[PDB]
Amino acid sequence: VLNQPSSVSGSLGQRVSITCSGSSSNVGNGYVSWYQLIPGSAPRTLIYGDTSRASGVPDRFSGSRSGNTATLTISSLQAEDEADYFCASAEDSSSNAVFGSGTTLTVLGQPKSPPSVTLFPPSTEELNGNKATLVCLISDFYPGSVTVVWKADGSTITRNVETTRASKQSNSKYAASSYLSLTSSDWKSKGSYSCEVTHEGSTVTKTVKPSEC
């Protein structure tokens, strides 16, 4: 395995470097590649042949090599660059390959971003099965933490609620979901339900009324 730093960090709009150390028989042989891994996406080839950029790769990604150490340098960091970076090289034949241990790149100094919240009522089709799921979708928030409160006719609901942890989107912001699982009768018995999402001291409220859905 090629030696990479487990973790590396840089600030927004600045420059960072990730190294990749091997031996004469891999990195020293002089044809190192670099790959980018974002959650929810397949690996992306960034660099090949030490220095060449693959199709669609911005100029601010650059590679180089000195003896048995290769370097991926990213200038003008953006939030979307937060990701896992891997190097690779052939080993003793063009058919035998070695990957690096990987480096997680964190981008510091990202601005605060409030959550976009959508509340969906149960569909008619689900109601026909005597089930009613209210779906609260929460996206595009940074940093990655929200708190969710459900309400109905002025009273807070806790039972039959399920809320996911925050997960990182492809654009570096975060997303999360909350589900209120009721029976059709429960759903019809109230005048309104609300999803209330708090993030960094700010609150967003969305509401549905069975008499309007």
């Binding site: 395995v1 042989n29 002089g30 044809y31 590649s33 790959y35 891994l37 929810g40 397949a42 690996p43 992306r44 080839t45 090949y48 042949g49 693959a54 891997f86 690779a88 090289s89 052939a90 080993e91 003793d92 034949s93 063009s94 058919s95 035998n96 390959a97 070695v98 990957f99 690096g100 241990s101 990987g102 959508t118 969906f120 009522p121 149960p122 569909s123 089709e125 689900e126 799921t133 779906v135 979708l137 996206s139 399920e162 809320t163 996911t164 942890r165 997960s167 989107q169 997303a175 999360a176 979901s177 589900y179 699982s181 549905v208 009324k209 309007e212 859905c213």
Partner: protein
Amino acid sequence: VQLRESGPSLVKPSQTLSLTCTASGFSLSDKAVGWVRQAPGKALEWLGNIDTGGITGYNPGLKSRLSITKDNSKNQVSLSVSSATAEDSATYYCTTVHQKTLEVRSCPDGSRLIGNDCRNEDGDDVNYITTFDYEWYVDAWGQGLLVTVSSASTTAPKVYPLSSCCSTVTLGCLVSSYMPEPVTVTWNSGALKSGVHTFPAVLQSSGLYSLSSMVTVPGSTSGQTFTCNVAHPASSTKVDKAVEPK
């Protein structure tokens, strides 16, 4: 160019995990094809590759369990991992691989290439040195296929439309009550990617998962239908749900 993995997304322990990769856009006898996997929270792990002549590279640590085969008539490459365990639960990626070998000729201690031969200070002809430079890198990645090595049961999801009550229109699909993970969602058979957002699933105490995919579209789309395509590979199920805002 398209690489599409296929095969059981659910494998019972100790059985042989097997996968197939079907290519298009190129002939399999023209490019090297290979397999790389990633288990959750771990590094990329090269499994192997096979070239046009049958030249095969295998992960040295896993070679005894791996089998990679080629079928040019069907433009297919196969992977097999014998005696599957939990360590083999991972996303398996089919890959196209650039392979090349360079023969490098150089002159030994104290000589230079005057003309074509390595000649020393006195002009005596000397034998050259031959070394090789090896080129390997992945130039095309498949979408990947998540394989889980467990004895889990199977329940296919119900799919319900998500639409707001009554300027941009927001809609989606609720993929309700399935197991095991994962489920994949596209919109309009992949033609609609802009504005899509598919959320990680929630887990009920019943053991069943649910997740939602939503899409935001311009308001000038009244009357239009948008179809979410949901795949539950573990149950070999695929559901298309047409959603039209009311």
